[PDB]
């Protein structure tokens, strides 16, 4: 088998009050991916973010990152590859990464709670593009889920998320329970999280560089973490404190 790693739950702002992409504080998350030896980052800003609209067409559109590279519809940053998402707050107050093409994450309404999951995947099924769901924290206080039964119908992996990896095992076997793929996202908002929690994937065929496409048709995912990943979450808790 042939192996890439995608941090899987990415926010390239700060916070959903943020107007301009702080393009300094971007690279400075770049060059953590680098050193950390991510394959890809997937960009799952909060939808309902001020800035998110600049923040997606910058990216993906408007080809303005400093330091970035666009060949063929893929944007790289010395060599780590950057995929278009979202994370959505649905109706029952979950979150939700969503993963497709650039052209369904601009449609989609970005009202806080605009969607359930029921209709989130009627809407992204309505379209024949392929989409991955990720069912995001999913036993963080505030983010619980009413229906887990309804989760496993809709959703395609269960992240086990960097900021709560003390109870990885609740992530894991939740994902048994529905038979479901598990991903690791590490939610990084700063350079220190990025990569916390990763997730590994095999691409069939000859060595090439992961697509976004390539990772959202991926199947048999799985998380990765380490011992010092826990340090990672504190370390950007105590840094966020610091710029207050
Ligand atoms: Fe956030
Ligand atoms: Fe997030």
């Known amino acids: 088998m042939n192996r890439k790693v995608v941090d899987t739950h990415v926010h390239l702002l700060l916070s959903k009050k943020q107007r301009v992409p702080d393009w300094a504080a971007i690279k400075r998350m770049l060059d953590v991916a680098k050193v950390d030896e991510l394959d890809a980052l997937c960009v799952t800003e909060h939808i309902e973010a001020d800035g998110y609209q600049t923040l997606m067409e910058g990216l993906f559109v408007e080809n303005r ?8 519809g893929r ?23 969503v ?17 359930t999951l029921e209709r989130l995947h009627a809407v992204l099924e309505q379209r024949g593009r392929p989409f991955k769901l990720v069912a995001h924290h999913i036993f963080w206080p505030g983010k619980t889920c009413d229906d887990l039964q309804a989760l ?13 990896l003390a109870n ?9 329970t529905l038979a479901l793929d598990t991903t690791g996202g590490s939610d990084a908002h700063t350079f220190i999280q990025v990569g916390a929690c990763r997730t590994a ?8 560089d992961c697509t976004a ?32």
């Open 65 to 72: 990152l400093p330091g970035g590279d666009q060949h063929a």
């Open 213 to 244: 496409q390539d990772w959202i048709s991926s199947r048999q995912t799985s998380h990765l973490f380490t011992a010092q990943s826990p340090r990672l979450v504190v370390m950007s808790n105590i840094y966020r404190q610091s710029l207050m």
């Open 168 to 176: 990885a095992q609740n992530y894991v076997a939740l994902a048994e």
């Open 99 to 115: 993963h497709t093409d650039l052209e369904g994450l601009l449609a989609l309404d970005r009202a806080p709670g605009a969607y």
């Open 75 to 97: 944007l790289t940053y010395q060599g780590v590859a950057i995929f278009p998402g979202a994370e959505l707050e649905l109706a029952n107050r979950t979150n939700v990464g």
């Open 201 to 208: 994937f095999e691409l069939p065929g000859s060595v090439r």
């Open 152 to 164: 496993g119908r809709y959703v395609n992996a269960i992240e086990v998320p960097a900021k709560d």
